[PDB]
């Protein structure tokens, strides 16, 4: 008996089902660490991250909501992206879109 304990049923949860995804190799060319959150518009991340920005347009990291991916200096790795939904209107970030797409 543990007060307020959970009885979570075994299994897994599939995230962002039915959404377009794409993988891109990213390399941190900066001298300081960079960490990116799940819903940040990937195409507008820190300029020190080298990758095909054109492919990442309208995408974010396909990872659990609220989590992040870290890139230590010189670190190269492949990440999976998932397309934005809703109105697919991008506002903020580095100010590169500021509108639909």
């Amino acid at each position: 008996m543990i007060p307020g304990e959970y009885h979570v049923k075994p299994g897994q949860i599939a995230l962002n089902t039915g959404r377009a995804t794409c993988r891109v190799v990213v390399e941190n060319h900066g001298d300081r660490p960079i960490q990116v959150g799940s819903h940040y518009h990937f195409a507008e991340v820190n300029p020190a991250l080298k990758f095909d920005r054109q492919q990442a347009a309208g995408y974010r990291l396909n990872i659990p909501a609220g989590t992040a991916v870290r890139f230590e200096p010189g670190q190269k790795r492949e990440v999976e992206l998932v397309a934005f939904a809703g109105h697919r209107a991008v506002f903020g970030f580095r100010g590169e879109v500021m509108g639909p797409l």
């Binding site: 008996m1 543990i2 007060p3 304990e5």
Partner: protein, 100 residues
């Protein structure tokens, strides 16, 4: 004494620990608030003695064992935190899983 609000607030914690201390002496298995009060007071006195934060973070895990508290209590206290005036001013002591 010119006691500030925080000093008076800590007097409340000290008194709550006295309650717990006497019940433990009687051989009772402590409940949730009693356990939190007892371990917390222990740390405040450690700070008064001049012990380091690092030392107290460890010592605080050996104040009460699972056999000295009611069932479920260890799980209700994932950690205990308290601040006190060390020789070098106020510091926060966090004791993780204090009851094993």
């Amino acid at each position: 004494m010119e006691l500030t609000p925080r000093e008076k607030d800590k007097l409340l914690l000290f008194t709550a620990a006295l309650v717990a201390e006497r019940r433990l002496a009687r051989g009772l298995k402590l409940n949730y608030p009693e356990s939190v009060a007892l371990i917390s007071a222990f740390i405040m006195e450690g700070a008064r003695d001049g012990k380091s934060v690092a030392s107290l973070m460890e010592e605080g895990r050996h104040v009460l064992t699972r056999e000295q508290v009611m069932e479920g209590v260890p799980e209700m206290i994932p950690d205990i935190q308290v601040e006190a005036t060390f020789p070098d001013g106020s510091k926060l002591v966090t004791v993780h899983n204090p009851i094993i």
